[PDB]
Design a protein around this ligand. Structure first.
Ligand SMILES: *[C@@H]1O[C@H](CO)[C@@H](O)[C@H](O)[C@H]1NC(C)=O
Ligand SMILES: *[C@@H]1O[C@H](CO)[C@@H](O)[C@H](O)[C@H]1NC(C)=O
Ligand SMILES: *[C@@H]1O[C@H](CO)[C@@H](O)[C@H](O)[C@H]1NC(C)=O
Ligand SMILES: *[C@@H]1O[C@H](CO)[C@@H](O)[C@H](O)[C@H]1NC(C)=O
Ligand SMILES: *[C@@H]1O[C@H](CO)[C@@H](O)[C@H](O)[C@H]1NC(C)=O
Lengths: 49, 49, 86, 22, 228, 96
């Protein structure tokens, strides 16, 4: 029986702009998506623990 | 994946396309990448359940 | 080389750390999307050498506190970062 | 032994290591 | 005569290094196990150039030594010439009227013409010589591979050889032969002149999707034809 | 300081005991380098534009440019331009 899964963390800024100075500013206009995704993934990780 | 943009590399678009024309392509890429990340998070939540 | 540097190779803009490459680039190769669809290496337009392009260190910073009600002392964790670079 | 296995994605280690589970 | 191509005709499609990865590419490839026309050098016919041609030769005395491309024998068609020499290979889009049959290296079978592109490079030299020709995007690309050795089953990938900026229009092509102490004329009978034994094959490319396996050393080691 | 970052992330002046993921850490570049070819001769675009004669529409003229530096600023010296539209590249960015 599986009990846990891998605890994954994602940097949305890097994933979307790939560490580019230009659209990093533009991504700010889209709001709090990054916070939502980070909170969901952190909850999943704490649930695995 | 291009998501309908001219290219999948942000540096290319910012290099040869003016801001007025580069902004639309960058938005096209950003929406697709955010959608992909949100899909990943949703599937992770289901699999975590 | 071996320093996290912003580069522009014939219009190939990017940022990373360039180091000596071990790739067996054939004469007709100019750059390499080697592994996982990533531009791992690029050919030097002047010295004709191949340099590995690695994105210089990143990581998530986590903050450990006992609570403002207890103390203002704080400990910081740099996730996935070797202490030689913080 | 029987089961076996950036661009902004990383894996966090579990709190309990294999030794403690053992 | 007809023979099947087995798994031959695959080449590097992008000139981009890839190692230890499986990559899918949609480009003009020779379909696996396709019927390829088979000829014996002992004139060989002019053949169509539909959407790219895969050319291979097997011999032990270097009897085949060039190719010609174009749409008609008229000099105004902007024909193409590729010929080998004792020390170099000569490429010219020299729009010269061609004789009824290929010359026999009798070292030339072309008339005078006003022409635009010329180039001399290092020579492209029991044998198994493989060539691929593509001209769909204002360029003429050549891929080649030489190995000792009907077409053998051995898998091999053709590396890019040269790239000609020529923008000529091509619909038909023919090869060039060699013969010692051979007389030549603008026209000749089917008897021709004595020459060594040699064989060559011709194949046609088609739009196909291929799955290419890249090894550790950045070399294509096997491929799969999805639609086969 | 890290505590202020944690407070801002939690949107509260009081933080409870625990571990909080506040932001991300990235090493900035130490320098900038540009690598380009070592050629020095300019392209003949200026001569082509100011040629003594121009080909007709019928049997128009084609030329291929290679092994030269394309300083497009030379073209701007001509005043009576009727069209300067470009597709796929902004004219101001051609220099780079
Ligand atoms: C100049 O550039 C050419 C083309 O890349 C190269 O072969 C040559 O080594 C370079 N020479 C110097 C001194 O950088
Ligand atoms: C806050 O601090 C006081 C004094 O140390 C302690 O008595 C109390 O239990 C603490 N409460 C919490 C929630 O930490
Ligand atoms: C951190 O880097 C140093 C220097 O390269 C190395 O000696 C050490 O083993 C590394 N530690 C970890 C945990 O990666
Ligand atoms: C070469 O140019 C001359 C003079 O313009 C012309 O008469 C002749 O037809 C041309 N030949 C070819 C093959 O174009
Ligand atoms: C790659 O090259 C090395 C060095 O020549 C050789 O030892 C190794 O066997 C090669 N690997 C393959 C898969 O050809």
């Amino acid at each position: 029986l599986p009990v846990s899964m891998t605890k994954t963390s994602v940097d949305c800024t890097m994933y979307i702009c790939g560490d580019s100075t230009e659209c990093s500013n533009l991504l700010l206009q889209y709001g709090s998506f990054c916070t939502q995704l980070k909170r969901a993934l952190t909850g999943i990780a704490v649930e695995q623990d | 994946s291009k998501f309908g943009a001219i290219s999948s590399v942000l540096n290319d678009i910012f290099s040869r396309l003016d801001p007025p024309e580069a902004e639309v392509q960058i938005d096209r890429l950003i929406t697709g990448r955010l959608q992909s990340l949100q899909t990943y998070v949703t599937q992770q939540l289901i699999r975590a359940a | 080389k071996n320093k996290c540097v912003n580069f522009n190779f014939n219009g190939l803009k990017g940022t990373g750390v360039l180091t000596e490459s071990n790739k067996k680039f054939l004469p007709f190769q100019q750059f390499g999307r080697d592994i996982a669809d990533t531009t791992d290496a690029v050919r030097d337009p002047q010295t004709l050498e191949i340099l590995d392009i690695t994105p210089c260190s990143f990581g998530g910073v986590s903050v450990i506190t006992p609570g403002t009600n207890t103390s203002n002392q704080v400990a910081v964790l740099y996730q996935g970062v070797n202490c030689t670079e913080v | 032994n029987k089961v076996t296995l950036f661009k902004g994605l990383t894996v966090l280690p579990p709190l309990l290591t294999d030794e403690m589970i053992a | 005569a007809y023979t099947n191509s087995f798994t031959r005709g695959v080449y590097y499609p992008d000139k981009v290094f890839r190692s230890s990865v499986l990559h899918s590419t949609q480009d003009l490839f020779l379909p696996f196990f396709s019927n390829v026309t088979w000829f014996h050098v002992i004139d060989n016919p002019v053949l169509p150039f539909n959407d790219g041609v895969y050319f291979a030769s097997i011999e032990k005395s270097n009897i085949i030594r060039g190719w010609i491309f174009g749409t008609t024998l008229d000099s105004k068609t902007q024909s193409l010439l590729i010929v080998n020499n004792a020390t170099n290979v000569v490429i010219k889009v020299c729009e010269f009227q061609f004789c009824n049959d290929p010359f026999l290296d009798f070292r030339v079978y072309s008339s005078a013409n006003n022409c635009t592109f010329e180039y001399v490079s290092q020579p492209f030299l029991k044998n198994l010589r493989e060539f691929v020709f593509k001209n769909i995007d204002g360029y003429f690309k050549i891929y080649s591979k030489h190995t000792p050795i009907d077409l053998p089953q051995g898998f091999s990938a053709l590396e890019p050889l040269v790239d000609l900026p020529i923008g000529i229009n091509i619909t038909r092509f023919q090869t060039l032969l060699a013969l010692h102490r051979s007389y030549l004329t603008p026209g000749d009978s089917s008897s021709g002149w004595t020459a060594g034994a040699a064989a060559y094959y011709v194949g046609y490319l088609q739009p196909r999707t291929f799955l290419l396996k890249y090894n550790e050393n950045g070399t294509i080691t096997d491929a799969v034809d999805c639609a086969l | 300081d890290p505590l202020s970052e944690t407070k801002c992330t939690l949107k509260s002046f009081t933080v409870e005991k625990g571990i909080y993921q506040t932001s991300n850490f990235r090493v900035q570049p130490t320098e900038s380098i540009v690598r380009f070819p070592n050629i020095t001769n300019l392209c003949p675009f200026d001569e082509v534009f100011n040629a003594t004669r121009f080909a007709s529409v019928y049997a128009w003229n084609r030329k291929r440019i290679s092994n030269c530096v394309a300083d497009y600023s030379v073209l701007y010296n001509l005043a009576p331009f009727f069209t300067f539209k470009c597709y796929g590249v902004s004219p101001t960015k051609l220099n780079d």
